[PDB]
């Protein structure tokens, strides 16, 4: 979530990030329940107040909401104890933020995002952009290893593929910001733009990437003015599931068919429908690539045709149960690297070593009855050093 992103920031960047136009406002909406109220109260005060008052301003019931709110904002450093007055810059900026101082676009966003996913999968026809490809490759969801050959899709790529568009997009932008620092792009400048949306060289390049993801569209040959799409600020289902592992999806976009084929065998493709079967071969194939049963059930659930919405649960139990079982069988044999011990002359030394391993966390499994245990190779040096030291 966005809260996780802002939480992991230094005080120095935070106040700089608290730009006048929006950041003081965008971070405000994040404040879940109570911090909003407390923020306004101490918005016209130039005198810090004792910490006891804040604690006793929430009734005994629901007192937990108070602690979480105060802890959440302390990390955001909106105020300082000064002994709880707010940051003068934020106070000033916020006061300036408080009385002081389309149909085609979504289709473009829908279309532009769809083609990106087409390129993400092994689609022979897709939009070509060297900057986009390398960005995804360094995004952690793709690896090429050979510039001449088109890059393949890593295990993380499939999991990302089956995610819903909001979570899919939001995570995608999350990696962009982390990679923005690595490439040298200032994080604060680019970040502030996203907040301003919901109301320089880097900016033009950053906007160009945003325009590439389909969030924005200049529409005037790359003019200064931009009209953000719906996805910039931040649908009925179609798949019908039977009880015999048969899927009838009313899909015309090749993306949906490609996604379904990832974990099912396609049988027929009608102009407004397609028939697929969820057989062991397909599901384990998807599980082998890296997917887990949760995404498929969620993916099938989210794209659920209205016909099956009446029945509760929406997905028939057998289909859900069978999918979960198929993944479980794959990981019946759980492999864990380790080093075994043998020939313990005395159990006291074995017990002492066990306590040492437990303290360091090196131990992975122990057997008191057989007087043996297993240690990962990383801890093998530590225990080996301990054995040498005697």
């Amino acid at each position: 979530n966005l809260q996780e992103f802002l939480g992991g920031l230094s005080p120095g960047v935070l106040d700089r990030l608290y730009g006048h136009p929006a950041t003081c406002l965008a971070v405000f909406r994040e404040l879940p329940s109570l911090a909003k109220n407390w923020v306004m109260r101490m918005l016209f005060l130039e005198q810090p107040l004792p910490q006891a008052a804040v604690a006793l301003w929430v009734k005994k019931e629901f007192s937990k909401a108070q602690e979480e709110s105060t802890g959440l904002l302390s990390g955001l450093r909106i105020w300082h104890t000064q002994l709880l007055i707010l940051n003068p810059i934020f106070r000033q900026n916020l006061r300036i933020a408080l009385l002081g101082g389309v149909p085609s676009l979504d289709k473009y966003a829908e279309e532009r995002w769809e083609v990106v996913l087409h390129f993400m999968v092994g689609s022979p026809s897709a939009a070509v952009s060297q900057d986009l490809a390398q960005l995804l490759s360094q995004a952690g969801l793709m690896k090429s290893t050979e510039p001449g050959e088109p890059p393949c899709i890593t295990s993380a790529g499939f999991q990302f593929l089956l995610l819903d568009t909001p979570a899919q997009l939001w995570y995608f932008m999350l990696q962009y910001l982390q990679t923005a620092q690595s490439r040298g792009m200032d994080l604060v400048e680019i970040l502030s733009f996203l907040f301003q949306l919901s109301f320089s060289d880097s900016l033009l390049n950053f906007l160009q990437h945003l325009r590439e993801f389909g969030l924005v569209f200049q529409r005037k040959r790359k003019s200064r003015r931009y009209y953000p799409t719906r996805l910039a600020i931040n649908q009925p289902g179609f798949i019908v599931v039977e009880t015999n592992y048969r899927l009838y999806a009313y899909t015309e976009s090749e993306l949906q068919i490609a996604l379904i084929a990832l974990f099912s065998e396609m049988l027929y493709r009608f102009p407004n429908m397609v028939v697929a079967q969820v057989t062991r071969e397909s599901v384990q194939q998807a599980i082998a690539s890296g997917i887990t049963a949760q995404q498929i059930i969620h993916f099938l659930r989210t794209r659920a045709h209205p016909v099956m919405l009446k029945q509760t649960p929406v997905l028939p139990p057998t289909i859900t149960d069978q999918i979960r079982l198929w993944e479980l069988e794959r990981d019946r044999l759980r492999f864990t690297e380790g080093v075994l011990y043998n020939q313990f002359l005395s159990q006291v030394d074995f017990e002492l070593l066990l306590a040492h391993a437990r303290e360091l966390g090196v131990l992975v499994f122990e057997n008191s009855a057989k007087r043996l245990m297993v240690v990962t190779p990383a801890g093998h040096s530590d225990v080996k050093r301990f054995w040498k030291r005697q």
């Binding site: 149960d321 979960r324 079982l325 479980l328």
Partner: peptide, 15 residues
């Protein structure tokens, strides 16, 4: 009365 068994009412799979 005459209610269905637990192992049939809900999935017994560890998921």
């Amino acid at each position: 009365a005459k209610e269905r068994p637990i192992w049939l009412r809900e999935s017994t799979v560890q998921g």
